[PDB]
Amino acid sequence: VQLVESGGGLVQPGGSRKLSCSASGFAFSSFGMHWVRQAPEKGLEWVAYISSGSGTIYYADTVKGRFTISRDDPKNTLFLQMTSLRSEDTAMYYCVRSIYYYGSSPFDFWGQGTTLTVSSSDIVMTQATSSVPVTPGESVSISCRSSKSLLHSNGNTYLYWFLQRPGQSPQLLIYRMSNLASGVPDRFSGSGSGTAFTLTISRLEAEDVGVYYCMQHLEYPLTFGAGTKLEL
Amino acid sequence: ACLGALATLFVLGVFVRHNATPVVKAAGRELCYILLGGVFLCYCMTFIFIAKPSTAVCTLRRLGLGTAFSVCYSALLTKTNRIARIFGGAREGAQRPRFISPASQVAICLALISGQLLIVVAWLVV
Amino acid sequence: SAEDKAAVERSKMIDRNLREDGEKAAREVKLLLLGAGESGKNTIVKQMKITGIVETHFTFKDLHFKMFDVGAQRSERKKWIHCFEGVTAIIFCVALSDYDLVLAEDEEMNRMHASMKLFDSICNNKWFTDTSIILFLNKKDLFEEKIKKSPLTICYPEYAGSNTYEEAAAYIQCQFEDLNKRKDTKEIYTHFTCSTDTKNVQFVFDAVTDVIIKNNLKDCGLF
Amino acid sequence: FTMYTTCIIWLAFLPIFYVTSSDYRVQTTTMCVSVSLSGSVVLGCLFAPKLHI
Amino acid sequence: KVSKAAADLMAYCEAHAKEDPLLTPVPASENPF
Amino acid sequence: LSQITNNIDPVGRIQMRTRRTLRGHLAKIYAMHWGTDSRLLVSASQDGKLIIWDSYTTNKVHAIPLRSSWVMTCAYAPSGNYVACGGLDNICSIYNLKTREGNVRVSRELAGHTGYLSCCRFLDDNQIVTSSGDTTCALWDIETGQQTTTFTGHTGDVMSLSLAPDTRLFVSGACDASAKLWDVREGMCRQTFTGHESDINAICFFPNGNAFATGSDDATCRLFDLRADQELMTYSHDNIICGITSVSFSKSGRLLLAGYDDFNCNVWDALKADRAGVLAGHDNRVSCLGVTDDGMAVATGSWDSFLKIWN
């Protein structure tokens, strides 16, 4: 149930350290894990992914051949080796679980992660807005675009929405842009065509200051984008 | 060789005449059939060895000798493997071991014969 | 096939897990138990290591035995037996001393007659034609005492013989082994059981090994 | 037992042809009788239950 | 009456027969199976 | 009445082939209940497992073990969140599908019967109904795990149960050659139908909620209504001797999907009373016929560990 990370601190570019994410309270042998990081100035970016049960491997374009990740089900741990570190990797690494099947809820629960500082084909998707003032209780309708048509052969779109509250884990809001996940109220309504997407929120509540992010799962590269922040 | 072929034909006939008896049912029916075929092919090879040597006849010799030996060897190997199965199955759980059906054993011995033919033609083309 | 790759990988993983579980289950031979009420069930299920039916599992000589005691079943036998295909053998527990007694169901039929009717019913069905039966004979000392006290002529009128235990046991060995239509595919293994002669699991072990060997040979036509 | 007998027959016939391979003028004639003896040995191994019945 | 029930069942089977793929030649391309 | 049903034009000989070959089971299949979304189905293995198969992509998602090795039947919730399992140990386990921190976890074990769970069904998320083997097809709850209504009135034992789209009534056939129409509200039996000789193996229900068909082991099917109190139509065959073990209806109700023990199934016509098509292709006898709510798939659960969608 919990996802606790440890092993952070000040490191040197090109050094060595051991990072793990301890998790207990679920079937770790039937849940794929991600390592999506969050930079303080740059949006999230997925780097690596292991299938459920030490299966297939998924990497990014600028990481293939540099990083190495292993898992241990009897030990229930994740072994990460950080080598050839650059001065531009300041981010918040997460230990997020996911399961994929018919009607599943991928990226349901996200980890906490630890921070670290240092001294001195591909699918891309753009956003619409950056930071606009939104008053609570106005039925906000957020829009988003894409660079591809979400018209897969199965007959459903692949657009997940996430929100990072201050000091709170980036929990899931809605999966497949048409089915609400667990832990959210019955106020989000997602729709749109294969290219453009929209999400209406009526009867807003307090603490709605998190930034919204979108994610597509048509291919291996997972890009969140810049981010559309909401003000008071 | 003619006497051996006659004996093989007679024993094959007396095997196929009565098949409901447990004597011929204990060993593999298809296995004993292919073993008798391999013995008959050994006798045909003995016939061919005494003939006018020709490139076609000589290639037929080179293939048929190995084929006739390998058929008998693979039939005996399959029979003894089934005997190892009956010996080791009672010690383990109550499950049907892999490759137990008669057609599966025919496929296995035919694959062994095909491998023998493959290696003999791979050395023949040189 | 783009986003469904994880689904197919999880399907293959759980399919490998199901195949492993099925191979582990096939390693455990399944046996059922039948008989009358209190026919010697506790004497054989209490020596092993171990409403609805009871299912126990015990390892012996690197072999897992899964015993299924039906016991009390309010429903009729025609239903749960009709859906019991895939078993190696069955067990029939009876007590030879239950020949002078009458069950408290009709006060007109003998307990041995009811056991013979149950045997003829479970041996003349389309589901237990290739299944063997292992007969357990519980409380043989009670049967010896009864045959020393009773001449057995009241239970079987057509029987004729002296007053002893060996010939009566032999007649029992030839009374439950002829109700079946054939003996080539319906082999029967009979064994005695009492307070003494502990560790009778060797007999059932030999019997299950023999029946699974005969089944594997009949699969390939070797039998 | 018959398989072991056939195997020792093979192991006994192998040096026979290994030493008779010299002077191939007679080896070309002994090949036929050697193959015939091998076929007869296999026939005996197979028909021992048939010969007993 | 049994005739009224039979007529009602026949009317229901004839009126809802358009949305039943078991009685109509559905194309195999657009069908998921 | 049999004269007014002879004027309808015959639908003719219909022939349908298989769509998906659900391979992976290594034991017998006794019940394969279908969901409401016409996409997922559940299948009850016989060794230790219960697999919720997919129909379109044909890929398994949850193959969950059970404490009971023998699973007599299964039921899939209309919401797709819980599943009910039969068996002989009188434990109708309710597994939670959409659970947090895990794949599938058991919610409650339903105990308190003496027969055997033969056919479970779900009225809603919580209020569920079972059909035990000791002539007690009582209703159950999930929150408390105790019975609320007990249905009696069958002489022998019951081994079949079917619900209604109205969810207020449900008919169930027992092994005494009688199907009783119980009401969930009052708990009593509205009417018990008579006219068949052999036992009722499995029973179906008409889509509208005014008729049903029972599966008798006498090679005879009957179309019995709810307000007529009389058998309307019968379907018999001469060149067969085995009886139907599972009956189902399509989205319209004309195609009666019957499953015999001839290692195949048949499609009867509810008006012409003639065998439209024969669905062969099973090595063993079929045990269940699951038709979707929209007639998009007709799955079969024959004992050969093969689920064939004949649509």
mmCIF file of N, CA and C in Angstrom, chain F residues 81-145:
data_model
loop_
_atom_site.group_PDB
_atom_site.id
_atom_site.type_symbol
_atom_site.label_atom_id
_atom_site.label_comp_id
_atom_site.label_asym_id
_atom_site.label_seq_id
_atom_site.Cartn_x
_atom_site.Cartn_y
_atom_site.Cartn_z
ATOM 1 N N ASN F 81 -17.924 -6.340 -10.625
ATOM 2 C CA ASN F 81 -17.078 -6.106 -9.466
ATOM 3 C C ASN F 81 -16.891 -7.332 -8.586
ATOM 4 N N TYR F 82 -17.843 -8.263 -8.579
ATOM 5 C CA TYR F 82 -17.761 -9.460 -7.758
ATOM 6 C C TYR F 82 -18.129 -10.679 -8.589
ATOM 7 N N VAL F 83 -17.651 -11.841 -8.150
ATOM 8 C CA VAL F 83 -17.990 -13.112 -8.774
ATOM 9 C C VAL F 83 -18.386 -14.100 -7.689
ATOM 10 N N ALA F 84 -19.349 -14.955 -8.013
ATOM 11 C CA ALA F 84 -19.792 -16.013 -7.121
ATOM 12 C C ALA F 84 -19.366 -17.366 -7.670
ATOM 13 N N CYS F 85 -18.960 -18.249 -6.762
ATOM 14 C CA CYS F 85 -18.456 -19.563 -7.127
ATOM 15 C C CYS F 85 -19.294 -20.628 -6.441
ATOM 16 N N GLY F 86 -19.558 -21.717 -7.156
ATOM 17 C CA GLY F 86 -20.323 -22.811 -6.593
ATOM 18 C C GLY F 86 -19.464 -23.768 -5.797
ATOM 19 N N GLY F 87 -19.602 -25.060 -6.060
ATOM 20 C CA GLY F 87 -18.806 -26.079 -5.412
ATOM 21 C C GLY F 87 -19.656 -27.046 -4.613
ATOM 22 N N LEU F 88 -18.962 -27.958 -3.933
ATOM 23 C CA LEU F 88 -19.600 -28.967 -3.103
ATOM 24 C C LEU F 88 -19.385 -28.747 -1.613
ATOM 25 N N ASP F 89 -18.490 -27.841 -1.227
ATOM 26 C CA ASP F 89 -18.199 -27.575 0.175
ATOM 27 C C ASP F 89 -19.147 -26.556 0.794
ATOM 28 N N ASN F 90 -20.202 -26.165 0.075
ATOM 29 C CA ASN F 90 -21.200 -25.215 0.573
ATOM 30 C C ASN F 90 -20.564 -23.875 0.937
ATOM 31 N N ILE F 91 -19.591 -23.449 0.139
ATOM 32 C CA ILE F 91 -18.898 -22.180 0.337
ATOM 33 C C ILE F 91 -19.034 -21.397 -0.962
ATOM 34 N N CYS F 92 -20.040 -20.524 -1.031
ATOM 35 C CA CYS F 92 -20.243 -19.663 -2.197
ATOM 36 C C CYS F 92 -19.390 -18.412 -2.012
ATOM 37 N N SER F 93 -18.105 -18.557 -2.319
ATOM 38 C CA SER F 93 -17.153 -17.476 -2.100
ATOM 39 C C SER F 93 -17.414 -16.323 -3.059
ATOM 40 N N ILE F 94 -17.331 -15.105 -2.534
ATOM 41 C CA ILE F 94 -17.533 -13.886 -3.310
ATOM 42 C C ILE F 94 -16.194 -13.169 -3.392
ATOM 43 N N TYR F 95 -15.558 -13.231 -4.559
ATOM 44 C CA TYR F 95 -14.279 -12.575 -4.778
ATOM 45 C C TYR F 95 -14.493 -11.153 -5.276
ATOM 46 N N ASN F 96 -13.718 -10.222 -4.726
ATOM 47 C CA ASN F 96 -13.786 -8.822 -5.122
ATOM 48 C C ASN F 96 -12.827 -8.587 -6.282
ATOM 49 N N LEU F 97 -13.370 -8.187 -7.431
ATOM 50 C CA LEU F 97 -12.549 -8.009 -8.624
ATOM 51 C C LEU F 97 -11.830 -6.664 -8.609
ATOM 52 N N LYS F 98 -12.589 -5.568 -8.592
ATOM 53 C CA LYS F 98 -12.012 -4.225 -8.591
ATOM 54 C C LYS F 98 -11.654 -3.854 -7.155
ATOM 55 N N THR F 99 -10.468 -4.287 -6.738
ATOM 56 C CA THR F 99 -9.972 -4.051 -5.393
ATOM 57 C C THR F 99 -8.710 -3.199 -5.441
ATOM 58 N N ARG F 100 -8.410 -2.565 -4.311
ATOM 59 C CA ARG F 100 -7.224 -1.732 -4.179
ATOM 60 C C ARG F 100 -6.081 -2.544 -3.585
ATOM 61 N N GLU F 101 -4.867 -2.276 -4.069
ATOM 62 C CA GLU F 101 -3.650 -2.938 -3.599
ATOM 63 C C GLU F 101 -3.755 -4.457 -3.760
ATOM 64 N N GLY F 102 -3.902 -4.880 -5.001
ATOM 65 C CA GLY F 102 -4.003 -6.292 -5.314
ATOM 66 C C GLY F 102 -4.839 -6.513 -6.555
ATOM 67 N N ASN F 103 -4.776 -7.746 -7.058
ATOM 68 C CA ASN F 103 -5.536 -8.103 -8.250
ATOM 69 C C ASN F 103 -6.982 -8.447 -7.902
ATOM 70 N N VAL F 104 -7.182 -9.513 -7.129
ATOM 71 C CA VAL F 104 -8.512 -9.966 -6.727
ATOM 72 C C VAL F 104 -8.406 -10.578 -5.338
ATOM 73 N N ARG F 105 -9.272 -10.139 -4.428
ATOM 74 C CA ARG F 105 -9.306 -10.646 -3.064
ATOM 75 C C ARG F 105 -10.715 -11.116 -2.735
ATOM 76 N N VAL F 106 -10.809 -12.199 -1.961
ATOM 77 C CA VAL F 106 -12.108 -12.718 -1.556
ATOM 78 C C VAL F 106 -12.744 -11.770 -0.545
ATOM 79 N N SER F 107 -14.046 -11.534 -0.699
ATOM 80 C CA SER F 107 -14.766 -10.624 0.187
ATOM 81 C C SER F 107 -15.427 -11.373 1.342
ATOM 82 N N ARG F 108 -16.314 -12.315 1.027
ATOM 83 C CA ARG F 108 -17.019 -13.085 2.039
ATOM 84 C C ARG F 108 -17.219 -14.509 1.546
ATOM 85 N N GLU F 109 -17.245 -15.446 2.490
ATOM 86 C CA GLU F 109 -17.509 -16.851 2.209
ATOM 87 C C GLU F 109 -18.914 -17.181 2.688
ATOM 88 N N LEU F 110 -19.767 -17.615 1.766
ATOM 89 C CA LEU F 110 -21.168 -17.890 2.064
ATOM 90 C C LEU F 110 -21.297 -19.336 2.530
ATOM 91 N N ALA F 111 -21.593 -19.522 3.813
ATOM 92 C CA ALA F 111 -21.737 -20.845 4.399
ATOM 93 C C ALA F 111 -23.056 -20.929 5.153
ATOM 94 N N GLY F 112 -23.525 -22.159 5.351
ATOM 95 C CA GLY F 112 -24.775 -22.381 6.049
ATOM 96 C C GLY F 112 -25.742 -23.272 5.298
ATOM 97 N N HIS F 113 -25.237 -24.026 4.327
ATOM 98 C CA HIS F 113 -26.035 -24.979 3.571
ATOM 99 C C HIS F 113 -25.501 -26.388 3.786
ATOM 100 N N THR F 114 -26.309 -27.372 3.388
ATOM 101 C CA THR F 114 -25.955 -28.774 3.539
ATOM 102 C C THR F 114 -25.865 -29.530 2.222
ATOM 103 N N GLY F 115 -26.360 -28.966 1.124
ATOM 104 C CA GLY F 115 -26.280 -29.625 -0.164
ATOM 105 C C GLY F 115 -25.037 -29.236 -0.935
ATOM 106 N N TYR F 116 -25.218 -28.633 -2.107
ATOM 107 C CA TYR F 116 -24.096 -28.171 -2.911
ATOM 108 C C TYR F 116 -24.553 -27.000 -3.765
ATOM 109 N N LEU F 117 -23.718 -25.964 -3.831
ATOM 110 C CA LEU F 117 -24.023 -24.796 -4.647
ATOM 111 C C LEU F 117 -24.031 -25.183 -6.119
ATOM 112 N N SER F 118 -25.206 -25.160 -6.745
ATOM 113 C CA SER F 118 -25.356 -25.638 -8.113
ATOM 114 C C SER F 118 -25.457 -24.521 -9.141
ATOM 115 N N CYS F 119 -26.106 -23.408 -8.805
ATOM 116 C CA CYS F 119 -26.251 -22.301 -9.749
ATOM 117 C C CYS F 119 -26.442 -21.015 -8.959
ATOM 118 N N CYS F 120 -25.418 -20.168 -8.948
ATOM 119 C CA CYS F 120 -25.478 -18.869 -8.302
ATOM 120 C C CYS F 120 -25.817 -17.791 -9.323
ATOM 121 N N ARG F 121 -26.500 -16.748 -8.856
ATOM 122 C CA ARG F 121 -26.856 -15.611 -9.691
ATOM 123 C C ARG F 121 -26.785 -14.341 -8.856
ATOM 124 N N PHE F 122 -26.680 -13.204 -9.538
ATOM 125 C CA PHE F 122 -26.589 -11.905 -8.885
ATOM 126 C C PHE F 122 -27.771 -11.046 -9.303
ATOM 127 N N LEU F 123 -28.553 -10.595 -8.320
ATOM 128 C CA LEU F 123 -29.609 -9.627 -8.591
ATOM 129 C C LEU F 123 -29.049 -8.214 -8.692
ATOM 130 N N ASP F 124 -28.160 -7.847 -7.778
ATOM 131 C CA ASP F 124 -27.509 -6.544 -7.794
ATOM 132 C C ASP F 124 -26.120 -6.703 -7.180
ATOM 133 N N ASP F 125 -25.514 -5.583 -6.780
ATOM 134 C CA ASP F 125 -24.165 -5.626 -6.224
ATOM 135 C C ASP F 125 -24.122 -6.416 -4.921
ATOM 136 N N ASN F 126 -25.126 -6.242 -4.062
ATOM 137 C CA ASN F 126 -25.146 -6.862 -2.742
ATOM 138 C C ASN F 126 -26.133 -8.014 -2.634
ATOM 139 N N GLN F 127 -27.401 -7.781 -2.958
ATOM 140 C CA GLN F 127 -28.431 -8.807 -2.825
ATOM 141 C C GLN F 127 -28.254 -9.851 -3.921
ATOM 142 N N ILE F 128 -27.800 -11.046 -3.544
ATOM 143 C CA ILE F 128 -27.539 -12.115 -4.498
ATOM 144 C C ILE F 128 -28.403 -13.318 -4.142
ATOM 145 N N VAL F 129 -28.504 -14.248 -5.089
ATOM 146 C CA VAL F 129 -29.330 -15.439 -4.942
ATOM 147 C C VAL F 129 -28.521 -16.658 -5.366
ATOM 148 N N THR F 130 -28.655 -17.742 -4.609
ATOM 149 C CA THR F 130 -27.970 -18.996 -4.887
ATOM 150 C C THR F 130 -28.994 -20.112 -5.065
ATOM 151 N N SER F 131 -28.496 -21.300 -5.408
ATOM 152 C CA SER F 131 -29.333 -22.488 -5.572
ATOM 153 C C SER F 131 -28.533 -23.684 -5.063
ATOM 154 N N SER F 132 -28.755 -24.047 -3.803
ATOM 155 C CA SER F 132 -28.012 -25.129 -3.181
ATOM 156 C C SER F 132 -28.575 -26.483 -3.606
ATOM 157 N N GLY F 133 -27.882 -27.542 -3.197
ATOM 158 C CA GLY F 133 -28.275 -28.895 -3.521
ATOM 159 C C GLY F 133 -29.172 -29.576 -2.517
ATOM 160 N N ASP F 134 -29.474 -28.926 -1.395
ATOM 161 C CA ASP F 134 -30.372 -29.474 -0.381
ATOM 162 C C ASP F 134 -31.751 -28.834 -0.448
ATOM 163 N N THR F 135 -32.215 -28.524 -1.661
ATOM 164 C CA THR F 135 -33.537 -27.938 -1.891
ATOM 165 C C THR F 135 -33.692 -26.619 -1.134
ATOM 166 N N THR F 136 -32.658 -25.779 -1.197
ATOM 167 C CA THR F 136 -32.680 -24.451 -0.577
ATOM 168 C C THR F 136 -32.002 -23.479 -1.541
ATOM 169 N N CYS F 137 -32.797 -22.872 -2.417
ATOM 170 C CA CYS F 137 -32.305 -21.823 -3.310
ATOM 171 C C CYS F 137 -32.466 -20.443 -2.678
ATOM 172 N N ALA F 138 -31.946 -20.312 -1.461
ATOM 173 C CA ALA F 138 -32.176 -19.127 -0.653
ATOM 174 C C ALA F 138 -31.428 -17.919 -1.211
ATOM 175 N N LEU F 139 -31.864 -16.742 -0.774
ATOM 176 C CA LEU F 139 -31.247 -15.479 -1.142
ATOM 177 C C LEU F 139 -30.198 -15.096 -0.106
ATOM 178 N N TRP F 140 -29.168 -14.383 -0.557
ATOM 179 C CA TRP F 140 -28.031 -14.054 0.286
ATOM 180 C C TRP F 140 -27.727 -12.563 0.223
ATOM 181 N N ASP F 141 -26.976 -12.101 1.220
ATOM 182 C CA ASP F 141 -26.420 -10.759 1.258
ATOM 183 C C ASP F 141 -24.904 -10.843 1.377
ATOM 184 N N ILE F 142 -24.233 -9.771 0.967
ATOM 185 C CA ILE F 142 -22.777 -9.711 0.989
ATOM 186 C C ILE F 142 -22.260 -8.981 2.222
ATOM 187 N N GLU F 143 -22.946 -7.917 2.641
ATOM 188 C CA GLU F 143 -22.482 -7.135 3.783
ATOM 189 C C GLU F 143 -22.524 -7.956 5.067
ATOM 190 N N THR F 144 -23.643 -8.633 5.321
ATOM 191 C CA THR F 144 -23.787 -9.442 6.525
ATOM 192 C C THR F 144 -23.399 -10.899 6.316
ATOM 193 N N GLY F 145 -23.418 -11.387 5.077
ATOM 194 C CA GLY F 145 -23.069 -12.768 4.815
ATOM 195 C C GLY F 145 -24.060 -13.784 5.331
#
